């Protein structure tokens, strides 16, 4: 589990979105596994605005923060998980690392802020849904 709280936005994995999230929907994209909802309270998270490919992500299944190198956001085939069929996922970044389904929503950060959230796993890779292209999270 996990979310990004930027301004009056909450960013979650689309597959983990709640009724409240859908009742307060701003934007969602199945192909990216992202959903953004509106919040009453101001969040304090900063979205990274950069092309960094090194960062640190939180892995809840190991209670560890792992430094990782990660790929550029791309359209990648993802094998079946407990929450999606085998399919193409867009704006996805891969690293070598541990990811169980419960690790979805772990934050990946660099010196510039939040890069993305864990969205995929298996075959010894961890996949992160990028958020750095969503410049509208910074305003409104
Ligand atoms: Zn960065």
Description:
The chain has 140 residues and is mainly beta. It has two domains: 3-44, no CATH class; 45-140, no CATH class. It is built from one helix and eleven strands, in the order ββαβββββββββ. The chain has one helix at residues 19-23; strands spanning 4-6, 9-13, 25-29, 34-38, 54-59, 64-69, 74-78, 87-96, 107-110, 113-122, 125-130. The strands form two sheets. It has a seven-stranded antiparallel sheet with strand order 6-5-9-10-11-8-7, with no helix packed on it. A four-stranded antiparallel sheet has the order 1-2-4-3. Strand 5 and strand 6 form a beta hairpin. The chain is globular and about 40 Å long. The protein binds zinc ion. Residues 48, 50, 52, 110-112 line the site of zinc ion (ZN). It catalyses: Selective cleavage of Tyr-|-Gly bond in the picornavirus polyprotein. It comes from Coxsackievirus A16 (strain G-10). The active site is at 15 (for protease 2a activity), 33 (for protease 2a activity), 104 (for protease 2a activity). Zn(2+) 1 binds at residues 50, 52, 110, 112. Homodimer.
Please outline what is shown here:
Strand 9 (107-110) and strand 10 (113-122) form a beta hairpin. The protein is mostly beta strands and 140 residues long.
Topology (elements, then pairings):
Blueprint: E1 4-6, E2 9-13, H1 19-23, E3 25-29, E4 34-38, E5 54-59, E6 64-69, E7 74-78, E8 87-96, E9 107-110, E10 113-122, E11 125-130
Antiparallel strand pairs: 1-2, 2-4, 3-4, 5-6, 5-9, 7-8, 8-11, 9-10, 10-11
The site of zinc ion (ZN) has 6 residues, from loops.
């Amino acid at each position: 589990s996990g979310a990004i709280y930027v301004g009056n936005y909450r960013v979650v994995n689309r597959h983990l979105a709640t009724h409240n999230d859908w009742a307060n929907l701003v934007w969602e994209d199945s192909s990216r596994d992202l959903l953004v909802s509106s919040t009453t309270a101001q969040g304090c998270d900063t979205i990274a605005r950069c092309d960094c490919q090194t960062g640190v992500y939180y892995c809840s299944s190991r209670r560890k923060h792992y430094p990782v190198s990660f790929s550029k956001p791309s359209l990648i085939f993802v094998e079946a998980s407990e929450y999606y069929p085998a399919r193409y996922q867009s704006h996805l970044m891969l690293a070598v690392g541990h990811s169980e389904p419960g690790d979805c929503g772990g934050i990946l950060r660099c010196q510039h802020g939040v890069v993305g959230i864990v969205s995929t796993g298996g075959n010894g890779l961890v996949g992160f849904a990028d958020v750095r292209d969503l410049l509208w999270l910074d305003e409104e």
